[PDB]
Amino acid sequence: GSLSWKRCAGCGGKIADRFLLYAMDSYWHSRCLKCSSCQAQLGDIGTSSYTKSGMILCRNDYIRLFGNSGAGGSGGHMGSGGDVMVVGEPTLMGGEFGDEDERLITRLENTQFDAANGIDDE
Ligand SMILES: [Zn+2]
Ligand SMILES: [Zn+2]
Numbered sequence: 627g628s629l630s631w632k633r634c635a636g637c638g639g640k641i642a643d644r645f646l647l648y649a650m651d652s653y654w655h656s657r658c659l660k661c662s663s664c665q666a667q668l669g670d671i672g673t674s675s676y677t678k679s680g681m682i683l684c685r686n687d688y689i690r691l692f693g694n695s696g697a698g699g700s701g702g703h704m705g706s707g708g709d710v711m712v713v714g715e716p717t718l719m720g721g722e723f724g725d726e727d728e729r730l731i732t733r734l735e736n737t738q739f740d741a742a743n744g745i746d747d748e
Contacts, residue, residue, distance in 0.1 A: 627740030634658055646741035648732030649675050649682065656735065662687045668731060672709030675730035685709045689723065697722035 632651060633639040636658020647654045647669055659668050659675075662683045668675060676688040683691055685707060696703070703721040706728060707713035713724075735741065 627742060629740075631740065636660070640743060641741065642743040644737070644741050645735040646739060647735070648739070649730050650677060653740070663690060669733045669735075671711050672707075672714060673731045673733065674707055674709045674728040676725070676728055677730060678727075685711055685728070688725070693723060695723075696725075700724070 631640070632648070632653050634641045634646075634654050635650065635652040636654045641653050641655065643655060645656045647656060647659050649659055649668075656667060656669060659682060660666070661668060662681050664684060664687060666684065668682070668684055671684055671686075674685050676683040676685070676692075678688075678692055681691075697720065700721040700723075703724040703726075704719055706724040706726040708729065708731070712718075712722075732739070737745075
């Protein structure tokens with residue numbers, strides 16, 4: 627698309643689908659990307675993605691795996707978390723583990739993004 631294809635690291639490679647996602651500088655499918663533990667829709671919980679141990683985790687997954695206590699001695703470290711689970715609605719803007727290690731999800735599931743492999747009818 628705007629650049630060269632980065633292939634789905636979830637399944638085979640070439641994404642000839644309408645539902646594409648960008649993660650880790652590669653491409654993924656909605657259920658190809660997926661969580662670590664929950665196995666939910668990373669692109670539906672908001673825009674956020676955590677990559678550690680070579681794994682792909684959501685915000686909740688992250689707190690469960692590498693959720694080091696970063697709430698109490700955190701004066702700043704806010705704004706991070708593109709999710710709509712904890713930072714979607716104002717609940718606690720105190721920067722409780724507001725790790726900026728995320729922001730790896732690029733999502734437009736249609737011919738809006740690089741989900742355009744080719745336009746060919748049957
Ligand atoms: Zn895939
Ligand atoms: Zn998860």
